[PDB]
Amino acid sequence: EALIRDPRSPINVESLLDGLNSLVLDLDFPALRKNKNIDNFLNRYEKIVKKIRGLQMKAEDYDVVKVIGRGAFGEVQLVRHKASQKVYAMKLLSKFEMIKRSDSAFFWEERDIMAFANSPWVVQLFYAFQDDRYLYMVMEYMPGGDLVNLMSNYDVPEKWAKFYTAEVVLALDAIHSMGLIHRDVKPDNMLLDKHGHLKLADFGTCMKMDETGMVHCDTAVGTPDYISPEVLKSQGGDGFYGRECDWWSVGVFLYEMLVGDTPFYADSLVGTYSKIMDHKNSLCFPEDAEISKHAKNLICAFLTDREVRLGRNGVEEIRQHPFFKNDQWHWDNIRETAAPVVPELSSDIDSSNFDDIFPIPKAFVGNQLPFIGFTYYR
Numbered sequence: 001e002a003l004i005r006d007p008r009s010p011i012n013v014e015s016l017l018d019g020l021n022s023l024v025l026d027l028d029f030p031a032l033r034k035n036k037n038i039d040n041f042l043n044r045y046e047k048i049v050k051k052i053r054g055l056q057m058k059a060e061d062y063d064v065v066k067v068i069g070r071g072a073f074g075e076v077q078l079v080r081h082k083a084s085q086k087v088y089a090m091k092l093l094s095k096f097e098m099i100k101r102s103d104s105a106f107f108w109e110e111r112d113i114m115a116f117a118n119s120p121w122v123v124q125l126f127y128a129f130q131d132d133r134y135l136y137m138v139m140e141y142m143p144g145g146d147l148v149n150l151m152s153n154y155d156v157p158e159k160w161a162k163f164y165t166a167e168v169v170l171a172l173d174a175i176h177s178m179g180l181i182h183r184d185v186k187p188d189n190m191l192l193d194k195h196g197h198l199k200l201a202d203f204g205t206c207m208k209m210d211e212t213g214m215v216h217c218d219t220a221v222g223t224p225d226y227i228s229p230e231v232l233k234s235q236g237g238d239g240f241y242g243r244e245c246d247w248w249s250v251g252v253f254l255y256e257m258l259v260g261d262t263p264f265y266a267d268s269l270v271g272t273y274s275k276i277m278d279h280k281n282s283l284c285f286p287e288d289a290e291i292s293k294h295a296k297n298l299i300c301a302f303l304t305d306r307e308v309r310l311g312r313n314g315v316e317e318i319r320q321h322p323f324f325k326n327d328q329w330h331w332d333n334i335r336e337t338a339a340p341v342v343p344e345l346s347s348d349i350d351s352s353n354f355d356d357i358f359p360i361p362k363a364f365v366g367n368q369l370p371f372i373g374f375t376y377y378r
């Protein structure tokens, strides 16, 4: 009864119900019911399980206002809780699609981080639940938009980039000191809160480090404009990198904010992938840049090989780069100072910073087994 009480422990009630409910799910097919045992079970339990499924958090308890972001295996809806009228962002992952086209385990870390970091820098998850087709992650909704939309609507001044970069650095470092590497740092994944401050999201790509502070992966992950050369090189086996691969992407982000184009752009993927590997020969600023001395400096210090990449030793040697000199904040209080863009929000459901958007088995498969334990209620 002890381990049962722990919502992190593998055998809490949320888990025990998921299994029982996953069992009925994966067994109630006319083919399989031709086994006596399976029918005996589904007889004794199908009525109760259907009643139970109704009492558990389900997709229907959420008014859906707009789809505000799509993705590889699902979408993110702006939803309002019908019974409590509270407003959340709800990510949906498709069990169908994760099973076929994925490692289909990325979601545990993504949930665990958003449910337990309790950091100013990490989007907070309140509920994880599921049904026969989908995983659901219910999180605080960030009404400021992402840094993509913002760069889309402003001539970003270095004062601002000095602000946003610092917040991303503190956030990546927060994520880091929790043992995790965020392998997919893009302006798409940096979100702005009610007051215009940064929060990281989409931890689909997170990997916990070992005690030596490295990860050993053997598949290239991320998105191509931002892939670091070691992760890109790691696709060929013997991938050994540390958290410095995030600072590479922080580099790409500063470049894109100030220049307006990604530093290793190419018409094709193979072009970008090649341009990344050849970064000593391919990184150049446009002659008509109007980029600062220290700005171009910091960016070049990020976009180099991992052996010599700035931030290798720690976060403290990024903070002290002259690019960060400013009459507007210090490093230990930047989330307490005013943000360069504060969203004019009229309502709790303001969606303005957002643009608009199985087989039946013969025998037993157990397609719902990977998802036992995902349900969680804070």
Ligand SMILES: CNC(=O)c1cc(F)cc(Cn2ccc3cc(-c4cn[nH]c4C(F)(F)F)ccc3c2=O)c1
Residues within 6 Å of the ligand: 068, 069, 070, 071, 072, 073, 074, 075, 076, 089, 091, 092, 106, 123, 139, 140, 141, 142, 143, 145, 191, 201, 202, 203, 204, 205
């Ligand atoms: C392997 N990755 C996938 O399959 C995948 C599936 C998806 F649906 C979406 C994505 C990428 N993406 C896009 C927007 C997004 C927005 C929020 C969020 C959280 N709180 N508030 C919001 C906001 F209001 F900004 F929407 C949280 C996560 C994501 C996010 O992950 C990836």
